[PDB]
């Protein structure tokens, strides 16, 4: 699925996103728009390592999920990288709620210091009622 950007703001608030390990919401909205433009089926293979990102946060196989294929190998959210190409994001938000977890934080996601970092990111929630 394709989400709206206000309907996803609403759903990651109540999934309880905004804040959490010190992320705004706006910020979640950034990471997302940059990673998979809000796709949920997405997917990007890396021939470099042989990984592949799965979703609408484009989490990684080499760590996070399982994928069988990505040598070396861990699955630190404890799910089949299968499970983050459904039209619900409960399973992405878990796992990345994980990511977070570890020192790097938000900062995991190259794209997120590219493209989000010291940036004003407001305009990714403005009018959504969040």
Avoid at 8 to 28: C, P, V
Avoid at 35 to 62: K, L, M, V
Avoid at 93 to 105: F, I, L, M, N, S
Wanted: glycine share 8%; charged share 25%; with cysteine.
């Amino acid at each position: 699925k394709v989400f709206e950007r206000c309907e996803l703001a609403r759903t990651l608030k109540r999934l309880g996103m905004d804040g959490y390990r010190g992320i705004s919401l706006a910020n979640w909205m950034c990471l997302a728009k940059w990673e998979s433009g809000y796709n949920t089926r997405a997917t990007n293979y890396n021939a470099g390592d042989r990984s592949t990102d799965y979703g609408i946060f484009q989490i990684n196989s080499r760590y996070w999920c399982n994928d069988g294929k990505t040598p070396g190998a861990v699955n630190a959210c404890h799910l089949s990288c299968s499970a983050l190409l459904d039209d619900n994001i409960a399973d992405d938000v878990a796992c990345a709620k994980r990511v977070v977890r570890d020192p790097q934080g938000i900062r995991a996601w190259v794209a997120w210091r590219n493209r989000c970092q010291n940036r004003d990111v407001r305009q990714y929630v403005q009018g959504c009622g969040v």
